[PDB]
């Protein structure tokens, strides 16, 4: 579970831009405040290789 | 400077459970995941399971079929780790180790001493 | 599951010597192996990861290497502080992580 990749993001990269805030993105209308769960996800999503 | 604080010692009688914690303090917690590491007195490590936060999941060691089951409140950034059915061979210190950066335990709890007997 | 054999499993040296231990796993498990070290009433610290880097804040006598399936710890200046066991991880396999017997160094 080392290797992980970003799954949501408010716009697409840049060509060359790394972009490694792990910030929670909030996908509904009501403010998650650093805090996942209801309409709060986690941007990073791990791949998990065996 | 992240620190593993877990529960304090534990006595249980054979045939019974324990449940330890192990509270992560600092850094990020989605990221890292907590190992558990048991050693019985005159031996060595042992290795009891991982809890994976980042992809949500928990594996438990082959040599203990169903006997670990750990789960966690990531609000809380706190481990859990069940041990089901003690018995006198289970006396041992149960620490939690974050496997964080290089998949190597870097940061070691304070380990607590859990002993099964009558 | 991979097992892991170390050897010498007890040790004696004195201060300033070398002192060699070797830590010989069953199948190849590339260069993923964590030496640490447990001395009594403490939690083992981490020393080496990936077989050959040193963890930050570890002393610089402390040196690893060896890939595959035989790998050795190696201390170049043995010091008192230095006397401890040292276990061996294998994080190559998450099911399950196999340590060391343990390498236990005493004062010669």
């Known amino acids: 579970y080392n290797y992980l990749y970003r799954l949501f993001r408010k716009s697409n990269l840049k060509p060359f831009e790394r972009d490694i805030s792990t910030e929670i993105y909030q996908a509904g209308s009501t403010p998650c405040n650093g805090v996942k769960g209801f309409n709060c996800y986690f941007p990073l999503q791990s791949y998990g290789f065996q | 400077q992240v620190q593993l604080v877990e529960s304090g010692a534990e006595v249980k009688k054979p045939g019974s459970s324990v449940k330890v914690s192990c509270k992560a303090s600092?850094?990020?917690?989605?990221?890292?995941?907590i190992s558990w590491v048991r050693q019985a007195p005159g031996r060595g490590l042992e290795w009891m399971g991982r809890?994976?936060?980042?992809?949500?999941?928990?594996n438990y060691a082959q040599n203990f079929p169903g006997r670990v089951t750990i789960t966690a409140d990531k609000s809380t950034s706190t481990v859990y780790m069940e041990l089901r059915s003690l018995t006198s061979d289970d006396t041992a210190v149960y620490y939690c180790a974050r496997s964080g950066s290089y998949d190597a335990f870097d940061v070691w709890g304070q380990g607590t001493m859990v002993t099964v007997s009558s | 599951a991979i097992r892991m054999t170390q050897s010498p499993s007890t040790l004696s040296a004195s201060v300033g010597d070398r002192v060699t231990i070797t830590c010989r796993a069953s199948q190849t498990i590339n260069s993923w192996l964590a030496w640490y070290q447990q001395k009594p009433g403490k939690a083992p610290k981490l020393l080496i990861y990936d077989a050959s880097n040193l963890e930050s804040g570890v002393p610089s006598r402390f040196s690893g290497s060896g890939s595959g399936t035989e790998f050795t710890l190696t201390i170049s200046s043995l010091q008192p502080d230095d006397f401890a066991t040292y276990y061996c991880?294998?994080?190559?396999?998450?099911?399950?992580?196999?340590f060391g017997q343990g390498t236990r160094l005493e004062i010669k």
């Open positions: 991880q294998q994080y190559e396999s998450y099911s399950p992580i196999t």
């Open positions: 809890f994976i936060p980042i992809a949500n999941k928990a």
């Open positions: 600092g850094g990020n917690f989605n990221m890292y995941t």
